[PDB]
Amino acid sequence: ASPKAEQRLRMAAQRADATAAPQPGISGPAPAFVHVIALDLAEEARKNPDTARDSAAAALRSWTELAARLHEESPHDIAEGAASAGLLPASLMVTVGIGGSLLSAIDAEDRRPDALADLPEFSTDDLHPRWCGGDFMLQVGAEDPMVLTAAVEELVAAAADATAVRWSLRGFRRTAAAARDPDATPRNLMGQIDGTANPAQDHPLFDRTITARPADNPAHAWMDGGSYLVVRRIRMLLTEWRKLDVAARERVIGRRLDTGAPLGSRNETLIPENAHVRLASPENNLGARMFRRGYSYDQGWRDDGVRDAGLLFMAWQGDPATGFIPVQRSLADQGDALNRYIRHEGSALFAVPAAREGRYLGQDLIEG
Amino acid sequence: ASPKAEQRLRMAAQRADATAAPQPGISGPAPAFVHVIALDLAEEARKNPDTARDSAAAALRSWTELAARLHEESPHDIAEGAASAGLLPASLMVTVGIGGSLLSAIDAEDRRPDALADLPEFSTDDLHPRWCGGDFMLQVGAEDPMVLTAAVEELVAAAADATAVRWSLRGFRRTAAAARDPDATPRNLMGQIDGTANPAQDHPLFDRTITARPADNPAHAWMDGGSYLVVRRIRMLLTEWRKLDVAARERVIGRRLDTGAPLGSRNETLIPENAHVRLASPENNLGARMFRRGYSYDQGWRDDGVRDAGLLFMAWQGDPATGFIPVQRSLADQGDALNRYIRHEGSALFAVPAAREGRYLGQDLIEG
Ligand code: HEM
Ligand code: HEM
Numbered sequence: 001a002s003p004k005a006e007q008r009l010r011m012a013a014q015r016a017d018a019t020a021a022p023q024p025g026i027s028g029p030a031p032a033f034v035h036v037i038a039l040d041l042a043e044e045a046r047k048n049p050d051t052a053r054d055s056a057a058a059a060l061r062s063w064t065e066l067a068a069r070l071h072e073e074s075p076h077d078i079a080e081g082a083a084s085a086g087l088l089p090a091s092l093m094v095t096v097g098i099g100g101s102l103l104s105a106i107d108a109e110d111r112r113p114d115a116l117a118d119l120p121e122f123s124t125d126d127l128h129p130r131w132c133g134g135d136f137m138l139q140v141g142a143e144d145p146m147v148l149t150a151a152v153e154e155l156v157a158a159a160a161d162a163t164a165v166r167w168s169l170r171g172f173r174r175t176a177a178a179a180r181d182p183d184a185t186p187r188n189l190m191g192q193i194d195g196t197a198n199p200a201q202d203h204p205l206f207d208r209t210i211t212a213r214p215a216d217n218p219a220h221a222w223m224d225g226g227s228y229l230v231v232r233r234i235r236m237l238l239t240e241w242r243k244l245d246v247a248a249r250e251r252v253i254g255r256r257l258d259t260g261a262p263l264g265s266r267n268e269t270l271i272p273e274n275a276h277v278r279l280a281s282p283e284n285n286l287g288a289r290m291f292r293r294g295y296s297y298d299q300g301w302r303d304d305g306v307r308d309a310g311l312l313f314m315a316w317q318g319d320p321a322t323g324f325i326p327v328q329r330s331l332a333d334q335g336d337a338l339n340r341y342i343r344h345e346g347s348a349l350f351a352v353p354a355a356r357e358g359r360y361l362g363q364d365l366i367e368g
Numbered sequence: 369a370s371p372k373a374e375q376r377l378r379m380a381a382q383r384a385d386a387t388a389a390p391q392p393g394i395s396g397p398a399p400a401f402v403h404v405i406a407l408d409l410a411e412e413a414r415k416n417p418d419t420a421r422d423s424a425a426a427a428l429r430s431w432t433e434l435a436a437r438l439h440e441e442s443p444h445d446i447a448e449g450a451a452s453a454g455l456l457p458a459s460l461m462v463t464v465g466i467g468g469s470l471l472s473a474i475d476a477e478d479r480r481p482d483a484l485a486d487l488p489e490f491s492t493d494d495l496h497p498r499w500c501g502g503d504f505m506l507q508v509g510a511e512d513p514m515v516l517t518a519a520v521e522e523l524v525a526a527a528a529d530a531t532a533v534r535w536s537l538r539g540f541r542r543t544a545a546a547a548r549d550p551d552a553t554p555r556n557l558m559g560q561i562d563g564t565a566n567p568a569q570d571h572p573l574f575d576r577t578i579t580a581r582p583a584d585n586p587a588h589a590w591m592d593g594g595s596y597l598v599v600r601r602i603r604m605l606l607t608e609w610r611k612l613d614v615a616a617r618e619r620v621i622g623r624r625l626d627t628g629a630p631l632g633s634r635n636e637t638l639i640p641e642n643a644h645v646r647l648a649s650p651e652n653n654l655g656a657r658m659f660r661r662g663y664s665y666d667q668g669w670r671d672d673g674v675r676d677a678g679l680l681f682m683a684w685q686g687d688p689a690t691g692f693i694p695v696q697r698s699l700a701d702q703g704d705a706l707n708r709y710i711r712h713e714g715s716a717l718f719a720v721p722a723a724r725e726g727r728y729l730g731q732d733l734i735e736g
Contacts (some may be wrong), residue, residue, distance in 0.1 A: 136439035168668035
């Protein structure tokens with residue numbers, strides 16, 4: 001035994017905080033596994049605003065109610081014969097989001113806040129249309145992949161009649177069980193420390209960065225206190241990346257691989273003109289800031305021997321126009337050193353509304 | 369702290385047994401994650417026996433030597449900037465196998481033992497050709513997915529010039545960190561306890577089941593004391609499976625979901641005529657026996673909304689003709705109750721030779 005050992009087990013052992021706002025899956029410790037699932041209203045229902053809106057109401061209610069249960073109970077408490085029987089709670093958490101395309105389907109474009117405007121095209125884009133967008137999102141996280149997939153099955157089933165999967169991707173980070181130091185910042189498939197410059201969660205900057213400011217227009221206020229998720233599936237050119245020596249890799253980002261220190265320094269907590277962290281800095285983007293909570297993905301190999309692995313990148317912010325968008329535009333247009341080694345292949349924006357007492361998620365938007 | 373807690377951490381904390389025979393990745397405790405990678409000799413080299421055989425020698429030597437290092441060191445000890453830096457050893461283990469197609473490429477059909485004859489077609493087959501076969505195999509296992517993918521990168525890179533990935537699949541089981549009882553038999557995506565009837569590893573039946581008996585012909589003796597791996601990618605029809613009530617599910621297999629006891633009993637440690645365990649029993653197959661060491665897989669959803677998830681099934685045996693083959697033939701032809709809910713979509717047979725002092729894996733076969 002040891003303190004560190006107890007600490008290595010905590011993420012697997014504990015339930016998540018079901019009260020975190022706007023919803024679970026943003027603040028608090030990040031579980032090791034994630035499944036991001038984009039869904040559309042079922043084809044037939046989607047054809048007409050009225051059936052579209054009924055199916056959305058059903059989907060969103062079922063999910064809300066099941067996310068409630070899954071935060072206090074495990075999948076195997078909810079149903080007999082689940083894959084997760086005999087397992088600890090593993091920080092299971094569920095987040096539900098709404099795409100701008102949902103508003104189109106239900107004829108509610110009047111309800112679309114400016115912050116939910118489609119993402120612009122970026123000059124480095126290499127997006128696959130089937131990996132873009134979606135009427136809804138489920139983000140499901142857990143510290144154990146079996147607990148994860150059991151919860152996914154129940155959540156997809158709860159809205160099976162009303163929705164269809166559009167795209168999905170599983171991701172991972174180091175397990176707390178295998179971290180020499182389970183409080184250390186996790187690394188990505190490029191070997192880099194990933195997360196250092198996020199605003200600290202015990203600091204007012206966190207909530208300010210994440211939280212949608214009140215809407216001027218009551219038709220847009222269903223997103224007050226919510227957050228916006230930009231998800232990007234970013235393939236890493238690892239074979240080419242591995243040809244670089246360590247110094248060169250460090251120059252691409254502007255931080256060292258060993259410690260995560262900016263270049264020329266000793267601690268995590270000179271920089272090339274085209275370095276990622278220089279071009280991405282709020283400083284270089286009129287104060288644009290986001291909270292990044294991304295996962296690695298490993299999908300083996302594709303045609304013609306291309307490595308299908310990467311960063312399932314996820315940025316949270318109050319308004320994409322003062323977060324992800326200006327920053328990505330700087331990285332795209334100003335020639336981030338990193339562009340060479342990455343390809344943006346999937347993209348989506350989801351509005352993630354604040355949970356409210358006595359109402360299902362997005363009930364305001366649906367109404368009733 | 370507690371004994372169970374220390375036990376939950378052990379798989380992440382320890383190195384694997386590098387001395388287990390024929391190779392690592394068969395006996396001992398099974399790590400939570402696996403990556404099964406089938407590779408072919410590179411296209412140009414493969415065209416002619418002489419360059420084929422040179423590239424095979426290179427591939428097999430590099431892999432052997434790197435598997436050696438990876439059993440005593442972690443990927444981040446082998447190279448700077450690895451994705452696994454700062455992580456515990458996580459039971460990393462590497463297994464190398466050889467397909468019968470390799471023997472064709474190197475013009476060594478004389479060397480093909482009878483046990484390495486291609487698997488027959490089965491009546492329930494639904495195999496995708498790109499997911500079948502392969503000249504080589506790498507099986508890489510670890511308790512942490514980040515440790516896993518770091519080791520994979522180094523192993524694929526070590527033979528990059530000489531080989532190309534043909535197909536691959538990642539799988540998982542419950543993590544030891546999240547098991548209420550980390551010694552309990554792991555479950556599958558159908559909720560079932562999976563592994564009960566395997567021969568016990570502290571029992572002579574284990575080695576007898578696994579181990580290739582000596583070859584009559586010295587040209588075939590390179591597999592003496594080795595083992596044969598049948599891998600099948602088996603998709604589960606989970607949506608249809610979940611329509612059944614618990615009793616009905618239990619009738620398909622012949623064991624209970626809660627405890628894994630045969631039907632009508634209390635302990636893991638009446639049965640329908642078409643029950644899986646009845647038709648699969650050595651009893652129903654002239655004593656045919658295998659060691660099953662499979663993993664779940666979750667690949668999200670495919671066209672047209674089909675759930676791409678399943679069992680990455682792996683059977684080890686001394687000779688497929690007295691193991692996997694007769695048993696699968698009984699399940700296929702005698703109408704296993706389970707057939708309804710599964711589809712065999714990928715298949716391969718690999719010869720996994722015994723490690724020998726002072727020689728690389730399969731050096732006998734290559735010679736020199
Ligand atoms: C595969 C793609 C990417 C990789 C590998 C990557 C990697 C990194 C690394 C290693 C850091 C430094 C450590 C840290 O502060 O977290 C970092 C920082 C950052 N990244 Fe990325 N990143 C990627 C894509 C993006 C994208 C698409 C955006 C935004 C559009 C973004 C925005 C940022 C920001 C804002 C910082 C912090 C800069 C600062 O204030 O110092 N990154 N990234
Ligand atoms: C998705 C496919 C499959 C599933 C879900 C499945 C599931 C199970 C389960 C739950 C058991 C009982 C627990 C145990 O003893 O391990 C079992 C036993 C067994 N399975 Fe499978 N199985 C599958 C495919 C296969 C295949 C393809 C083979 C061989 C060709 C096979 C051979 C066996 C054998 C030999 C036993 C032990 C029977 C005994 O002696 O009692 N299984 N399987």
